[PDB]
Design an enzyme around this catalytic site. Structure first.
Site, PDB file in Angstrom:
ATOM      1  N   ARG A  54       0.900  -1.245   0.151  1.00  0.00           N
ATOM      2  CA  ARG A  54      -0.225  -0.019  -0.075  1.00  0.00           C
ATOM      3  C   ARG A  54       0.912   1.169  -0.105  1.00  0.00           C
ATOM      4  O   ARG A  54       1.536   1.780   1.013  1.00  0.00           O
ATOM      5  CB  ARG A  54      -0.996  -0.142   1.045  1.00  0.00           C
ATOM      6  CG  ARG A  54      -1.710   1.099   1.427  1.00  0.00           C
ATOM      7  CD  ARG A  54      -2.801   1.115   2.509  1.00  0.00           C
ATOM      8  NE  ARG A  54      -4.046   2.081   2.435  1.00  0.00           N
ATOM      9  CZ  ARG A  54      -4.080   3.140   3.148  1.00  0.00           C
ATOM     10  NH1 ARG A  54      -3.099   3.508   3.910  1.00  0.00           N
ATOM     11  NH2 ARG A  54      -5.302   3.844   2.773  1.00  0.00           N
ATOM     12  N   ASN A 101      -1.638  -0.771  12.723  1.00  0.00           N
ATOM     13  CA  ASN A 101      -2.386  -1.711  13.738  1.00  0.00           C
ATOM     14  C   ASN A 101      -4.013  -1.678  13.199  1.00  0.00           C
ATOM     15  O   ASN A 101      -4.163  -0.938  12.066  1.00  0.00           O
ATOM     16  CB  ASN A 101      -2.156  -0.998  14.932  1.00  0.00           C
ATOM     17  CG  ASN A 101      -2.500   0.404  15.155  1.00  0.00           C
ATOM     18  OD1 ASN A 101      -3.797   0.809  14.786  1.00  0.00           O
ATOM     19  ND2 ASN A 101      -1.752   1.095  15.992  1.00  0.00           N
ATOM     20  N   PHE A 112       4.704   1.529   8.536  1.00  0.00           N
ATOM     21  CA  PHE A 112       4.715   2.238   7.311  1.00  0.00           C
ATOM     22  C   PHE A 112       5.761   3.244   7.409  1.00  0.00           C
ATOM     23  O   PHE A 112       6.383   3.441   8.670  1.00  0.00           O
ATOM     24  CB  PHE A 112       3.387   3.025   7.167  1.00  0.00           C
ATOM     25  CG  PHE A 112       2.946   3.782   8.443  1.00  0.00           C
ATOM     26  CD1 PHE A 112       2.439   3.293   9.260  1.00  0.00           C
ATOM     27  CD2 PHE A 112       3.251   5.057   8.396  1.00  0.00           C
ATOM     28  CE1 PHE A 112       1.868   3.797  10.632  1.00  0.00           C
ATOM     29  CE2 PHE A 112       2.642   6.008   9.558  1.00  0.00           C
ATOM     30  CZ  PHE A 112       2.129   5.434  10.513  1.00  0.00           C
ATOM     31  N   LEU A 121      -1.676  11.100  13.058  1.00  0.00           N
ATOM     32  CA  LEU A 121      -1.477   9.597  13.381  1.00  0.00           C
ATOM     33  C   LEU A 121      -0.728   9.694  15.189  1.00  0.00           C
ATOM     34  O   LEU A 121      -0.691   8.639  15.617  1.00  0.00           O
ATOM     35  CB  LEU A 121      -0.619   8.987  12.535  1.00  0.00           C
ATOM     36  CG  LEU A 121      -1.122   8.959  11.085  1.00  0.00           C
ATOM     37  CD1 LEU A 121      -0.118   8.245  10.118  1.00  0.00           C
ATOM     38  CD2 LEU A 121      -2.521   8.172  11.052  1.00  0.00           C
ATOM     39  N   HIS A 125      -0.667   5.438  16.595  1.00  0.00           N
ATOM     40  CA  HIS A 125       0.644   4.632  15.828  1.00  0.00           C
ATOM     41  C   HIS A 125       1.533   4.772  16.608  1.00  0.00           C
ATOM     42  O   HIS A 125       2.194   6.064  16.992  1.00  0.00           O
ATOM     43  CB  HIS A 125       0.631   4.980  14.439  1.00  0.00           C
ATOM     44  CG  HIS A 125      -0.723   4.650  13.587  1.00  0.00           C
ATOM     45  ND1 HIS A 125      -0.773   3.435  13.099  1.00  0.00           N
ATOM     46  CD2 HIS A 125      -1.379   5.310  13.380  1.00  0.00           C
ATOM     47  CE1 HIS A 125      -2.151   3.554  12.472  1.00  0.00           C
ATOM     48  NE2 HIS A 125      -2.374   4.776  12.552  1.00  0.00           N
TER      49      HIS A 125
END
Length: 164
Positions: A54, A101, A112, A121, A125
């Site tokens: 991704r 997650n 990532f 984020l 994360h």
């Protein structure tokens, strides 16, 4: 004292280059040790041969699903899904290495690399490392992503391990 790990990236099987990371074991030891372990393969499983599934330009490159190759799999070295260790470190810009997650306390193997400051984020994360060398290789990878994250070529971790 902080360990350094490398990924050797390939694009449709052709060598692209090496990215190296500093892992912040001084601040997030359980999360750094998971990623270190998976990168050496010393538990019998890990990142070697897995893909970045991704990639969203200007956003981040996500990988580490070495079990299902598509974002639904992966596993930590701890036999289950470990906890969010802490949120001391923040998503401050390109090169930040952070855990993917499925909600609170669901860390596995997916991670990532940020290619831009991603403050939304923070607190969600766990940041545990940063690109040391080879940010230009991450930038070259990013160009094979797309708006919805689908990659136009297969981006693989052809080799990986611990440096220094």
């Amino acid at each position: 004292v902080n360990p350094t790990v490398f990924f050797d990236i390939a694009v449709d099987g052709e060598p692209l280059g090496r990215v190296s990371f500093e892992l912040f074991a001084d601040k997030v030891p359980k999360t750094a040790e998971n990623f270190r372990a998976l990168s050496t393969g010393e538990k019998g499983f890990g990142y070697k041969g897995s893909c970045f599934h991704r990639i969203i330009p200007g956003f981040m490159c996500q990988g580490g699903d070495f079990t299902r190759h598509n974002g639904t799999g992966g596993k930590s070295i701890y036999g289950e899904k470990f906890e969010d260790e802490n949120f001391i470190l923040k998503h401050t810009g390109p090169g930040i290495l952070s855990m993917a997650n499925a909600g609170p306390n669901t860390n596995g193997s997916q991670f990532f690399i940020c290619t831009a400051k991603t403050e939304w984020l923070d607190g969600k994360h766990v940041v545990f490392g940063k690109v040391k060398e080879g940010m230009n290789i991450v930038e070259a990878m990013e160009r094979f992503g797309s708006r919805n994250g689908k990659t136009s070529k297969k981006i693989t971790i052809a080799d990986c391990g611990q440096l220094e």
